[PDB]
Structure 1
Amino acid sequence: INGVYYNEISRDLDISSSTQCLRFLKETVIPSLANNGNNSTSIQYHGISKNDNIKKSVNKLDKQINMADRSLGLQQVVCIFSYGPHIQKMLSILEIFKKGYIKNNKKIYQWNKLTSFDIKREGRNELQEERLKVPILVTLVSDSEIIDLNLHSFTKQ
């Protein structure tokens, strides 16, 4: 990998190291798609890697959905994000949480977004360069139907 590009802008990231890319996703791509200032939402960020325990992740997630106080009128949304091959484990943990939560006669409303990092490698020859794309899946799950967030570019599920 020679360089990492997002939104036609070069960034200083590394695909093999998960911490830097997860912090970049938490700090840049989420504020560029959702704004927590003009509304009354409590957003809980969570990134999933492939070395995380599924049961511990679910035990963190079922707590992160009931952290804010309910009396003042706060809508609590938890945004899970991952990239690359860790998206499989992310989906597994999301589906296990859905299975373990929907059993209590409740519903989880979900919004999905898919973007891409643009990385560059040196081709077979010395005069060729290949451009690879790494997928980025960001999901927002909440118990309430309507959210005042800018969710026009998401997918209602």
Structure 2
Amino acid sequence: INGVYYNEISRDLDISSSTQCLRFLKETVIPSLANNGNNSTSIQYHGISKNDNIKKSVNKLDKQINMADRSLGLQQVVCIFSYGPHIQKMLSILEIFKKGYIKNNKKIYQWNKLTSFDIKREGRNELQEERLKVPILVTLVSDSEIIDLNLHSFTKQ
């Protein structure tokens, strides 16, 4: 891997390093798509690697949907995110969490977003350089139907 680009801008990342790319997703990508300043949302960030325990991460998601104050009238949004081959494990920690929630006669309102990194690698030949593309899954889940975030580019689920 020669280099990792996001939104056609040169970045210093490593695909084999999970922590740096998860902090880059947390610090740069989500403020580029959602702004928490001009509204009353309480966003709890969480990233998922493929080495994570499913039950422990779902139990961590069981405390982030009821973490903020209920008296202030703040709507509580959980922003779960992953990139590449970890996303599948994310999906388990997504849907089992939904399996832990719809039995109590309640609903999850869900927003999905798909973007990508563009990495440069050497191909089969030295003169031929391959451009590979790594997908990113960003899911915002909440118990409220209408959220004042800029979520026009998302997908309502």
How far is the alpha carbon of 1:86 from its aligned partner? 0.4
Secondary structure at 1:46 match in 2: strand
Secondary structure at 2:93 match in 1: helix
Give the root-mean-square deviation of aligned CA atoms.
0.4
Which digits, 9 at most, give the CA deviation of each residue in 1:9-67, with x for residues without a partner?
Answer: 01000000100000000000000000000000000000000000000000000100000
Counterpart Cα distance in 1 of 2:75 and 2:90: 23
* Residue in structure 2 matched with residue 147 of structure 1 by the alignment: 147
* Residue in structure 2 matched with residue 24 of structure 1 by the alignment: 24
May I ask how many residue pairs the two structures share in their alignment?
Answer: 157
How far is the alpha carbon of 1:123 from its aligned partner? 1.3
* Residue in structure 2 matched with residue 106 of structure 1 by the alignment: 106
How far is the alpha carbon of 1:8 from its aligned partner? 0.3
Secondary structure at 1:85 match in 2: helix
Counterpart Cα distance in 2 of 1:104 and 1:124: 54
Counterpart Cα distance in 1 of 2:38 and 2:49: 31
Secondary structure at 1:37 match in 2: coil
Secondary structure at 2:59 match in 1: helix
Give the structure-1-normalised TM-score: 0.99
Counterpart Cα distance in 2 of 1:77 and 1:113: 15
Which digits, 9 at most, give the CA deviation of each residue in 1:82-135, with x for residues without a partner?
Answer: 011100000001000001111100000000000000000011111110000000
How far is the alpha carbon of 1:2 from its aligned partner? 0.1
* Residue in structure 2 matched with residue 70 of structure 1 by the alignment: 70
Structure 1, unpaired ranges of 5+: none
Structure 2, unpaired ranges of 5+: none
Give the structure-2-normalised TM-score: 0.99
Secondary structure at 2:101 match in 1: helix
